[PDB]
């Protein structure tokens, strides 16, 4: 099976994987509809009902021969960042029409609906909004919100309407099958990953305001370094952090002093801050622990700061009960997995609220995503479409 | 006395700090092409208004001698670099100068023709901000600067011939720093000149998601630097002064928000009167930064560019001035220059030694800068006085 799947892939992935090469294929772009179009082909040809929504998300559907009204829903977003590979987004779609399209013409129909679906857009690309796709499904979008975007999407033949659309209710499970992006499994020596939850994300951009001096003809005890400062800080702070322990990451990825010259002792210092953690109160608490530190360590020192939190977003955890059947399938068949986390937002974050959800995450070779280097082996590529097929069939062809 | 130059300085500092004024802010005087010339001319004049041999030499420095009976071959120069920066100056270089040519011209005038021939200079740059080349006009006067013409001005076919004739060089500084501010003290007798060393330690790590990577599985290369700084700089502290270390130039990469830095590419500066206790230091740094990174696999990078030894001053210049600080009730602090002048690549050939007048809050160079008008007339006052125990003493 797992031997099926890999010729599948093989054959269809570099298929679709020719739809915005140099991987690129962003919102509403010429390669984005004919991607679209050329899947929703396929998909057609196979034997599904496809079609669009108002936003242009692609769907599936092998109707139900019990609970037609009762849709299983999996997919993931079709638009790559510009040089971005092919397994991120692109690849979870492609599983699920490989999956549905096995299991159809293996028990035959299922007893409830199954859809498969290529969303619009997830990670912002191209226009300054994300989950495009996702959230206009449960009509999260308000057209007021958004080359003109209007201009991009008519192009593709598409409308964004004068208000929100209707969220849709027939949603009864979606899983969101989706490359780690990491390198847990991959160092653990695992395939299979049983994300339980979604991280959750605050993000800050801190300045440091001391004094700006000669490097020589100031003694040390006169100084207000700023970049001194951030040293303490981050330094400081890191070790709080990595004694807290997983699932906690903390980040200090830019940092500009000013001057920023070797002998000038920076007087200013405006650096960032990227904090996840998947319990609210736990990523709470410690961020402001560390809002704490930070005044602390510079009302010492003499140093101004202003703190800014422009990104706070709250974890998103996974459906219990979908997790436990995934979990128990995960032995049932026995198989190479771990239940982990992500500690990155997906598409099925937007879904998880309003319906039943759950991911199935599979390694990332070296933690390249978004990033023409990103690749996984086609083997692994074959256990989560095989996980996914396996999966889908307790939700849809089982009462 | 004091308020005598207070108004000499007062009248001859604003003028003479008006050849190059910057109306964008400050002062912009600037190597050969125009503005820095007119300068040389005027600054020329008012010596020739004197028994002051004003001339030039085959580079652009100025002088201006009194010529003096009995050793009239034995000079005692003074002064410092006329150039400056883009913007501001004003005291930089420029009143050292100013200061030597109304120290002579008073005493020259109150004293009549001294001993040994003194002799008043207004050298031709200095940390020069325009071409890639610094101390251009002292380097010369000893002929060190291996080789303008619009400015009327060919240089050499090979290095000048050293000058064998200078008994003494003083220069009258600034500070640049806040240490006799700070101190309520006026006077400065530069002991010694700092003796450089800076790096260009470059850290590889690896770029890794902000949240998909574990912590265990990080190599930050700015967490890394993080660890660098704070623990060299807690050292640094407690060597106590004059030591002094500096991270001021940091770059990390990617550099943004959401993505760990793979590669952080920082400098350091450090600072102190004695080599053995520069090198151990930085020896030191070195190891700690090589045993951190190896530590969190992380590899270093390290390109000691700068290695500058330090330039003391004449000891027995030194002496004279201080005892000179003593007759007169003079409230002075004998310290360290923590930075370079013209004074260092003197200080190798002739006796040397530097006069400090206190500076603003430590602010030079840029247009803030300001010296108290009656803590410059003690400047031009104890020049006076010295430069009078080296020409005119008997």
């Known amino acids: 099976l797992i031997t099926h799947f890999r010729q599948a892939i093989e054959e269809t992935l570099p298929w679709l994987s020719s739809?915005?090469?140099?991987?690129?294929?962003?919102?509403?772009s010429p390669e984005w509809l004919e991607t679209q179009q050329q899947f929703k082909k396929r998909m057609a040809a196979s034997g599904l009902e496809t079609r669009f929504d108002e936003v242009g998300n692609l769907y599936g559907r092998l109707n139900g021969t019990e609970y037609p009204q009762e849709v299983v829903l999996s997919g993931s977003h079709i638009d790559t960042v510009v040089n971005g590979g092919n397994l991120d987004g692109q690849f979870?779609?492609?599983?699920?029409?490989?999956?549905?399209?096995?299991?159809k013409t293996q028990y035959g129909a299922p007893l409830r609906?199954?859809?498969?679906?290529?969303?619009?857009?997830?990670?912002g690309?191209?226009?300054?909004?994300?989950?495009?796709?996702?959230?206009?499904?449960?009509?999260?979008?308000?057209?007021?919100?958004?080359?003109?975007?209007?201009?991009?999407?008519?192009?593709?033949?598409?409308?964004?309407?004068?208000?929100?659309?209707?969220p849709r209710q027939d949603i009864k499970a979606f899983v969101e099958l989706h490359i780690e992006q990491?390198?847990?499994?991959?160092?653990?020596?695992?395939?299979?990953?049983?994300?339980?939850?979604?991280?959750g994300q605050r993000r800050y951009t801190v300045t440091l305001n001391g004094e700006s001096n000669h490097a020589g003809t100031t003694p040390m005890g006169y100084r207000r370094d700023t970049v001194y400062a951030?040293?303490?800080?981050?330094?400081?702070?890191?070790?709080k952090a990595?004694?807290?322990?997983?699932?906690?990451?903390?980040?200090?990825?830019?940092?500009?002093?000013?001057?920023?010259?070797?002998n000038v002792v920076p007087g200013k210092t405006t650096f960032t801050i990227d904090c996840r953690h998947t319990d609210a109160a736990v990523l709470r608490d410690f961020t402001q622990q560390l809002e704490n530190d930070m005044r602390a360590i510079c009302d010492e020192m003499d140093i101004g700061i202003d703190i800014d939190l422009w990104m706070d977003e709250e974890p998103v955890p996974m459906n219990k009960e979908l997790v436990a059947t995934l979990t128990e399938l995960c032995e049932r068949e026995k198989l190479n997995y771990r239940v982990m986390h992500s500690?990155?937002?997906?598409?099925?974050?937007?879904?998880?609220?309003?319906?039943?959800?759950?991911?199935?995450?599979?390694?990332?070779?070296?933690?390249?995503?978004?990033?023409?280097?990103?690749?996984?082996?086609?083997?692994?590529?074959?256990?989560?479409?095989?996980?996914?097929?396996?999966?889908?069939?307790?939700?849809?062809?089982?009462?």
């Open 125 to 166: 690309s191209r226009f300054p909004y994300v989950f495009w796709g996702s959230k206009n499904i449960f009509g999260l979008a308000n057209p007021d919100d958004v080359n003109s975007f209007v201009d991009a999407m008519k192009a593709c033949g598409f409308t964004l309407p004068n208000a929100p659309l209707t």
């Open 19 to 28: 739809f915005g090469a140099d991987m690129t294929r962003l919102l509403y």
């Open 242 to 262: 990595k004694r807290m322990g997983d699932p906690l990451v903390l980040t200090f990825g830019k940092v500009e002093p000013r001057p920023n010259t070797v």
């Open 230 to 239: 951030f040293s303490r800080i981050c330094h400081q702070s890191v070790e």
């Open 92 to 103: 979870g779609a492609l599983a699920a029409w490989l999956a549905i399209d096995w299991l």
């Open 113 to 123: 609906t199954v859809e498969v679906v290529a969303m619009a857009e997830e990670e």
């Open 182 to 199: 990491g390198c847990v499994l991959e160092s653990n020596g695992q395939s299979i990953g049983v994300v339980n939850a979604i991280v």
């Open 343 to 399: 500690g990155a937002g997906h598409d099925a974050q937007i879904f998880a609220p309003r319906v039943p959800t759950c991911m199935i995450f599979i390694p990332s070779i070296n933690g390249i995503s978004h990033n023409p280097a990103e690749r996984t082996n086609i083997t692994d590529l074959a256990e989560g479409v095989k996980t996914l097929a396996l999966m889908l069939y307790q939700l849809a062809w089982q009462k």
